[PDB]
Amino acid sequence: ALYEDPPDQKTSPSGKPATLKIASWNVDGLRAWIKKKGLDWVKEEAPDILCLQETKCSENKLPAELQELPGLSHQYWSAPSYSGVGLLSRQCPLKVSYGIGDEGRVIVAEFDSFVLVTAYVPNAGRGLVRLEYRQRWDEAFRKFLKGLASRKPLVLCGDLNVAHEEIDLRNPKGNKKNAGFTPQERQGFGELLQAVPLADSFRHLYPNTPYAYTFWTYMMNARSKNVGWRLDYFLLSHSLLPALCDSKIRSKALGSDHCPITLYLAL
Amino acid sequence: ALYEDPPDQKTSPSGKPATLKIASWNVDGLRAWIKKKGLDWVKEEAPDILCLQETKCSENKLPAELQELPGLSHQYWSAPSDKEGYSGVGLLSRQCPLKVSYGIGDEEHDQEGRVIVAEFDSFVLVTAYVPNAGRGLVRLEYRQRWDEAFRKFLKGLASRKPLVLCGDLNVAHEEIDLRNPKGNKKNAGFTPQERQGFGELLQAVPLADSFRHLYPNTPYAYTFWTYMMNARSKNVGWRLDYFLLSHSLLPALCDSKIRSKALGSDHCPITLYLAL
DNA sequence: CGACGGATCC
DNA sequence: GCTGATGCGC
DNA sequence: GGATCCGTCGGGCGCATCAGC
Ligand SMILES: [Cl-]
Ligand SMILES: [Mg+2]
Hints:
The structure is a homodimer. Helices cover 21% and strands 23% of the residues of chain A.
C-alpha cells in the first residue's frame, strides 16, 4: 500500500551530472500553501525551476514571501480571468508565454536546450460534468504541444489530472467512471504520449513500480493510507531521455492534497 | 579639455568610512566586453555590487569566466525576450539580496530586461538601462512614457528603505553633462523631454545626482563617448550613467567616481562609495 | 553624434 | 562550423 | 570677420541572421 520514492539519481545513463532541477507542485491554494510552509520546501529543494498549479490567487494578491526567493527570481503567473499557475525560474528564460495559443492553466518558458510547459489540466469534475470540456482541452493541448516540440525538445510538467494506467492509482476498478480514470481521459493521455511524442519520465524509469501517487483526497485520510493517484507528471521529448537522471515523487512534502514532483536533467 | 577624476574619497563628509562599493557599467555587449578584458577591471575594482547594462546576452550564453567571480556569486540577469542581442541588464552581488525583481511592473509580459530591483538590508538598489530615444528621436515618446512609468514605479516602491538608482539613464541632465550641449539639444540623450524627465525623476521620487552633488561645478566629466571619430581620446563625451540616491543617503555618500580610464565599452564604469 | 559647411550676429 | 555580409540599434 | 548657430552627413561598435561552403 504505502510508497517510498527511491533516492535521487543525479547522473545520466551516460554518466553526465544533472545540471537542471525542476520541481512542479499543485499547491491547491497558493496562499494556504504559503501559510503551510510550502516555500520552506522550495527553499530546501532549491530547484532551478518551480512550477505551481491551482494557485487560486490573483496576481495582485500574491503573498510577499514569494519575493523572498532570489534563487527563483524570475516569476511568471497566469490567473484564470479555480485554477492559476506559476513558473519560477533561477535563470532568465529566453521567452515566456501563456495559454495554449487558442483560463490560467498553462505557462510556456523557453530555455536554451528545451521548452518547459507547465499545465494545470482541467479536472473532469464530480459526476463528469466537465468531462467534455476536458476532452476538448486535451485535444487542443495535444495539438498545441505538437508544434512546440516540432521546434525544440519539450518538458511538460504539472497536474495532468489523469492516471494513465491502473498502476497509476490505488482503486482503478472503482474509478473507471470518475474524473481522472475515465477511458476518455486515459485515452487522451495515451494520445498525448503517442502524438507529440512524449515519454512519462517517471514511468520510463519505474515501469514496474506500483503505489506511487502524487494526489490524495483530503478526505477519508486517503493520504495516510496512500489511497491516491499519480496525476502530476514530467513528460519529456524522447530526445531528452539521454539527459533524464531522475523523476521524483516527493511523497512526504505537505501543504496541499498534491505532493511535489522533481525532475533531474543532465543538460 | 581632458578630465582626471579626483582621487577616491572613501570617507563621508562626517568622517564615516565607506562600507559598500557599487560599480555600474554599460558594457556595450557583455561578450565583447569580456573579451576586451572588462572582467579584469571588475576584479581590480572589487566592487560589492556590480550592475551592468547592455549585456546584449541571454543567460544561457554568459561566458564561463562570469562564474569565476567568487566575490560576486549572486548573479541576476535579465534579457529582453523578442529583442535578444539588445538591452540586457545584470546585477552581481557579493551578498545575496533579500529580494530580486525585474522590470517596472509587468516584466512577466513585457520581458524588457532593462531593470533589476534588488532589496538589501539597508537599501533598495535599482539598476536601469533606460530606453534610448533613438537616432532622429524616433522612440523619444516611448522614452517619455517609459520615464513616467519608471518614475511612478520608483515612487511606488513599497519600502521605507532608501533607494539607490544606478546605471545608464541615457540622458545628460544639464549642459555641463556633455561636451557639446548646443549641437546635441535635438539628439537622443539631451532633449528637453529627457532632461525634464530626469529633473522630474529627481523631484518626484525624490533623488539626488550623487556625482553632481559632490562636484556641482566640475565640467568635462563624462561616462560615455561615441566610438566614432576618436571622441573618447578627445574627451568629447556625455554623462549618461549615474548613481541617484534618496536624500536620506547623502550623509552616507563618500564619493561618486567616473572610471574614465577603464576601456572595453563606449561607456566607462562609475563607482559609488557609501558609508552604511 | 561629432565633424562639417554654410548662414547669422555685430 | 566558420566567415563575413547585411540589418539594426546604440 | 571670429564666434556662434544650425542642419546634414558619414560612421564606429556589438550582435542576430543569413548565405555560402
Ligand atoms: Cl538570473
Ligand atoms: Mg550603447
